């Protein structure tokens, strides 16, 4: 009547999403021309980015940063792109300024993670690292979650420009100088956006499960896959087929079941009274 | 659609290139600075050459522009200090006659030697020569000798040069729909279209001349006690009813008194509070010099230095085998970096001076978060009032005895508060009537109230009625007297340093009414007030966008500069003068000349 | 880049009763001499299941038929092969670039298994070469789809090399399938059991084992199978002319809802099987 131990089993971590290769990823796109990686069909381990110290910003927006293992989602969407260390506050529901109506605007329901690190050893020359752009002139705002690579020439006034530069007429991107005697603020600030969606289709994105440890000859509850019984685990001397799972006596009550790690079947018996 | 949506675009573009350009140029400057070679000077004058033509361009770009249809104050401001078109409304030929003639006396200036008339194998400069027997000599021959040979060789060679440069120049600033040159500079202080706080350009020189009425009776008792002590190094020199001689003030031309505190020391016995010895005995460096300043500012309540300013600034000379430009300098390059240039040695001066340059980065950081036009202080003498006011509140004996540099058993005594009095006298009031003088003959030449026949008789009458000073001998149209100074051969203005040392006074007295200080005004500490620090980061912060006496109001209280403030600074010092003079005769009269 | 197919006389369909075949395991649970009763899409033991041919005569009906065909609850897909003339199934509702599609093909490299909205073809196939200089195969011009776009599902399988020659004589192999969508889940059974048949499978009794649960929130309601083609030196033919297809049928039989008694033996495999209708 007193099962003490709790024991939690599931099969091997396995798959881990790429979160190295945006995160890592050597060379970034500007923020006009942001990639939006797709991630799905893999477990993503969020513990490893929210305990690392090398992420300045790691607000989330809409969900808990401890819970993020605990949850399912159908696919994860991360946006990569460089961005000014004085406009990072700028990629977040609700914000105004040139990023947020011109480059990239968050939703007011968004929810995810921002995470942004500073990044003045690698895209900052000497001389002026003139490789990233923002769009600074547009002739409306930009929707949630749009890109916009058009290079026409911003019309600013009544006079019709002729695809050219001059009056009135300025080139949509302008590039950034980030130079690496430059303060904080001016620092290139390389920002990922990790947009949760959730739709009708199944679940392929998780938290890892954790897994502890086995024992035997001992009254504990157990939970393997969906089973959440009570009882004592032995050694059995059956053999499953390849894909079964568990199985029942004749009672319809939960007998034995495989470990997903060890692949081995194991007797369960009510803990008598 | 409109004028001003097209204008905040173009400010906007302007905001992004400009930018990023005077960046580069500021690097060129700082890596030519701090490194002197024959590549870094080409690469500031490349640098320095497209940054000039990005400005013309942009200038000549945003003049399209009416500045009637704006209604926005922040534009409208930026697209006025924009549209600046001052040495391109005139002629090529005229432009280029007065940019040689700005060249030839910068060289005359600069490149001016006089040679001994007993011994012409070795000549003197200015710098290593007459400045050092204008302050250091005692004697009346050799300063007269000096006095008379720098008027002599250098102002007979500007008569000409600056008889064309004011025209050049009045014919430049009536270009550009102004009626003189002196209300050229007098535009510096104006500012329109908003009610209450608007701000004439004749009203300026009302202001100052009741300042100066106003401040006159503690001038006149200086000079009488300066007199009095000087009677007695000159016996029969100066006269105890006349003015003081032009060579006898420890200048070369009488601009700081400060050399002449050897001379009148109220008390001699005491020494000045001096911290050098304190300083090299407890191991002092230029980094832990700068990390106190940067502490006493972070009491005040202002933010840290930023990481930059500690990895990328030089606080110590290099060394021999690279050379470098010496001069404390406060560099804002821009993009939210910080530098300051200067080869700080182990030395209470170097304490005041780093504390000043740390006043002038706090003040630039302040206004970072504006746009690149108005990235300025609020007026030309802010900048200088807010390094002055935290010198001159890191230089108290409290200050000091808490940092730990003064022993805690030191006592304060009257006598060395009226030789501190009398040394900040000496170089901050002594510099305001000559100031005065000087800009009031330049507005008054350039308005054209004194013909070109009358310059240098004016002058003397004006530094002879309006100063304590008379020429020794009699100097013809052809010594042109006025223009052996710096400011004045390379066109400075000068009313600056007048309005800045009423503004350090101001800010000092209202900064330490807000810190809850009782007693004197010289003897206020605002190191741990983080009221006062709000209240002057409230002011900070506006920059150039906000007028002046905005910031006036937000600083002080008060939206037009007083006097009151610098009365109250020197008042013990004020009855100690009056105290003094007893028998002294206070005043002078114009009638007295040692010729 | 499709080519249709001409020279394809076209023959009535032909139907053929099917067996006790079609009965796989509703679920991953454990039994051991006992009959339970499930209550899942399963298969009848006797109903009409559409024969489809495709052989290749000497002369004087080619058939190469390959339709698409409905999927209402679920498709029972039995294949009789002797040189592995079905390379896929192209799953999904109108097979446009509009909605997305199931995509499952084998070109004798890797399983592909790819959810996209493809731009597919009405004859997608694959082709063969019968190479008489280094006497291989090395089967080429892959056509299936031409336009493939917002992809949301990948999965390649190991290199290898199968058989890709061309066998003479009888069926030598039997893949039976039975796809089901439910849940947003696809489920895959599969079951190989080799055989030795001309035509008209023999009766027995094969439990389908589940061999994937692919989770992908598509509608299905029509697939097509992929067949391959052959093609060699004595072939007439340029652009659409000029192949021959190997001897190979598949079958397809609809799943409806009805009740069954599963026998299980001492190892937990199924034996025999009641329909109640
Ligand atoms: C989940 O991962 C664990 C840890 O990797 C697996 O446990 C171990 O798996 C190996 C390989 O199947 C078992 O065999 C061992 O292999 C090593 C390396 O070849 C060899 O040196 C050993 O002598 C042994 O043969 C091993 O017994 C097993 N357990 C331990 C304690 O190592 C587990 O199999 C994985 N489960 C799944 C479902 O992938
Ligand atoms: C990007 O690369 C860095 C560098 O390797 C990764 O940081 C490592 O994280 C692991 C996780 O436990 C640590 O054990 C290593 O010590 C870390 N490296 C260093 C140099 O400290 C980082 O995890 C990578 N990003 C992602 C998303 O995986
Ligand atoms: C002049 O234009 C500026 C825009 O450059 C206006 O500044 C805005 O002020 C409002 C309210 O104070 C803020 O919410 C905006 O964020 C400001 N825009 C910025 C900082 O770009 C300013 O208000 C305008 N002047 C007047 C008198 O309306
Ligand atoms: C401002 O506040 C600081 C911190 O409270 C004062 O520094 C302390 O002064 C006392 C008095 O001598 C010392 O006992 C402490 O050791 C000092 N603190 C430290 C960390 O050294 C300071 O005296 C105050 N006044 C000024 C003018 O700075
Ligand atoms: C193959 O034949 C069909 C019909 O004879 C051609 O027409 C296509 O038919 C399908 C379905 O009926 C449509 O989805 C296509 O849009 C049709 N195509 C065109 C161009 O109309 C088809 O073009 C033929 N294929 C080739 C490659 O010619
Ligand atoms: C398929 O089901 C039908 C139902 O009766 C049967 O085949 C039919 O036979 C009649 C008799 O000539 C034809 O007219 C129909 O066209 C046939 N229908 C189909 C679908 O084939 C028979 O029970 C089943 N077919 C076979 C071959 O057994
Ligand atoms: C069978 O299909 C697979 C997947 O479509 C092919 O594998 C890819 O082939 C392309 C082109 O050769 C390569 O760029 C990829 O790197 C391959 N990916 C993998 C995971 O192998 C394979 O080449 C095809 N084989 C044949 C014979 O057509
Ligand atoms: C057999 O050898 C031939 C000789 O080249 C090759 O088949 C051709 O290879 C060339 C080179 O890329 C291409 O024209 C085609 O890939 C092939 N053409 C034909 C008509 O087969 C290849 O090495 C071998 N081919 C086979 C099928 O085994
Ligand atoms: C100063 O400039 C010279 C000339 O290029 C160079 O050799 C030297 O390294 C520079 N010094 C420093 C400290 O960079
Ligand atoms: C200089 O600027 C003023 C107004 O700022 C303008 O009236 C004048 O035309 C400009 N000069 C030239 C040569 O365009
Ligand atoms: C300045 O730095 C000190 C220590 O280096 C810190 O305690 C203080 O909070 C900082 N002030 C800021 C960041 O405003
Ligand atoms: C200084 O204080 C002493 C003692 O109170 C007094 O005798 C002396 O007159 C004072 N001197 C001045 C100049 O105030
Ligand atoms: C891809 O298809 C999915 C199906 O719902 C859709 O949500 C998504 O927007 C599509 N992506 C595109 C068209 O880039
Ligand atoms: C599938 O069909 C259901 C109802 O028939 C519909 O609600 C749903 O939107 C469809 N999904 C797709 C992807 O077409
Ligand atoms: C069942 O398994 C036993 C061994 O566990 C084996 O001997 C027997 O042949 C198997 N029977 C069937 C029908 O698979």
């Known amino acids: 009547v007193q099962p003490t131990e709790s024991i939690v089993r599931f099969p091997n971590i396995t798959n881990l999403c790429p979160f190295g290769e945006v995160f890592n990823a050597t060379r970034f796109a500007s923020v006009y021309a942001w990639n939006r990686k797709r991630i799905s069909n893999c477990v993503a381990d969020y513990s490893v980015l929210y305990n690392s110290a090398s992420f300045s910003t790691f607000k989330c927006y809409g969900v808990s940063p401890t819970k993020l293992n605990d949850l399912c989602f159908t696919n994860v969407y991360a946006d990569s792109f460089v961005i000014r260390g004085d406009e990072v506050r700028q990629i977040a529901p609700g914000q105004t300024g040139k990023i947020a109506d011109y480059n990239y605007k968050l939703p007011d329901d968004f929810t995810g993670c921002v995470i942004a690190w500073n990044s003045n050893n690698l895209d900052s020359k000497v001389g002026g690292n003139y490789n990233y752009l923002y769009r600074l002139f547009r002739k409306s705002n930009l929707k949630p979650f749009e890109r916009d690579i058009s290079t026409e020439i911003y019309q600013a006034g009544s006079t019709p420009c002729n695809g050219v530069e001059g009056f009135n007429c300025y080139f949509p991107l302008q590039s950034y100088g980030f130079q690496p005697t430059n303060g904080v603020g001016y620092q290139p600030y390389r920002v990922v956006v990790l947009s949760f969606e959730l739709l009708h289709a199944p679940a392929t994105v998780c938290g890892p499960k954790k897994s502890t440890n086995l024992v035997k000859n001992k009254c504990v509850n157990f939970n393997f896959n969906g089973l959440t019984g009570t009882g004592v685990l032995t050694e059995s001397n059956k053999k499953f087929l390849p894909f079964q799972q568990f199985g029942r006596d004749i009672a319809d009550t939960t007998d034995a079941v495989r470990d997903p790690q060890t692949l081995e079947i194991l007797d369960i018996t009510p803990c008598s009274f | ?595």
């Open chain 2, 1 to 595: 659609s409109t004028i001003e949506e097209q204008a905040k675009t173009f400010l906007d573009k302007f905001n992004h290139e400009a930018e990023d350009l005077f960046y580069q140029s500021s690097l060129a400057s700082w890596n030519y600075n701090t490194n002197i070679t024959e590549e870094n000077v080409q690469n500031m004058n490349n640098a320095g050459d497209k940054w000039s033509a990005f400005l013309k361009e942009q200038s000549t770009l945003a003049q399209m522009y009416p500045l009637q249809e704006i209604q926005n104050l922040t534009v409208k401001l930026q697209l006025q200090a924009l549209q600046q078109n001052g040495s391109s409304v005139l002629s090529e030929d005229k432009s280029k006659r007065l940019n040689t003639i700005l060249n030839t006396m910068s060289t005359i200036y600069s490149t001016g030697k006089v040679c001994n008339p007993d011994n012409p194998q070795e000549c003197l400069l200015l710098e290593p020569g007459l400045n050092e027997i204008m302050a250091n000599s005692l004697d009346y021959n050799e300063r007269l000798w000096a006095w008379e040979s720098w008027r002599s060789e250098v102002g007979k060679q500007l008569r000409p040069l600056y008889e064309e440069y004011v025209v050049l120049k009045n014919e430049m600033a009536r270009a550009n729909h102004y009626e003189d040159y002196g209300d050229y500079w007098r535009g510096d202080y104006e500012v329109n279209g908003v009610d209450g706080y608007d701000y004439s350009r004749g009203q300026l020189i009302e202001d100052v001349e009741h300042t100066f009425e106003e401040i006159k009776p503690l001038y006149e008792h200086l000079h009488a006690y300066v007199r009095a002590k000087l009677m007695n190094a000159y016996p029969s020199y100066i006269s105890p009813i006349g003015c003081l001689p032009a060579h006898l003030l420890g200048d070369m031309w009488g601009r700081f008194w400060t050399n002449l505190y050897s001379l009148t020391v109220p008390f001699g016995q005491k020494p000045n509070i001096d911290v050098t010895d304190a300083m090299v005995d407890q191991a002092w460096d230029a980094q832990r010099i700068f990390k106190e300043a940067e502490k006493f500012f972070v009491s005040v309540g202002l933010p840290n230095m930023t990481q930059g300013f500690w990895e990328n600034s030089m606080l110590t000379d290099p060394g021999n085998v690279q050379k470098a430009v010496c001069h404390p300098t406060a560099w804002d390059l821009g993009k939210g970096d910080f530098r300051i240039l200067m080869c700080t040695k182990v030395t209470m001066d170097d304490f005041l001076t780093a504390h000043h340059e740390m006043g002038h980065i706090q003040y630039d950081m302040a206004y970072a978060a504006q746009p690149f036009l108005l990235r300025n202080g609020a007026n030309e003498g802010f900048h200088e009032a807010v390094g002055e006011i935290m010198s001159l509140s890191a230089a108290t004996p409290k200050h000091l005895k808490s940092i730990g540099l003064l022993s805690p058993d030191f006592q304060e005594d009257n006598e060395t508060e009226i030789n501190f009095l009398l040394k900040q006298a000496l170089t901050i009031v002594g510099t305001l009537p000559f100031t005065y003088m000087l800009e009031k003959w330049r507005w008054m030449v350039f308005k054209g109230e004194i013909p070109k026949d009358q310059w240098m008789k004016k002058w003397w009458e004006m530094k002879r009625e309006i100063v304590g000073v008379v020429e020794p001998v009699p100097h013809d149209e052809t010594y042109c007297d006025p223009a052996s100074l710096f400011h004045v051969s390379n066109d400075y203005s000068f009313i600056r340093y007048y309005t800045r040392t009423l503004y350090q006074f101001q800010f000092q007295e209202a900064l330490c009414q807000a810190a809850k200080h009782e007693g004197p005004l010289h003897k206020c500490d605002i190191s741990n007030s983080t009221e006062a620090g709000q209240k002057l980061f409230n002011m900070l912060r506006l920059g150039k966008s906000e007028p002046w006496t905005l910031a006036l109001e937000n600083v002080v209280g008060a939206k037009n500069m007083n006097v009151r403030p610098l009365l109250n600074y020197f008042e013990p010092l004020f009855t100690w003068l009056k105290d003094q003079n007893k028998n002294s005769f206070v005043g002078w009269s114009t009638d007295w000349s040692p010729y």
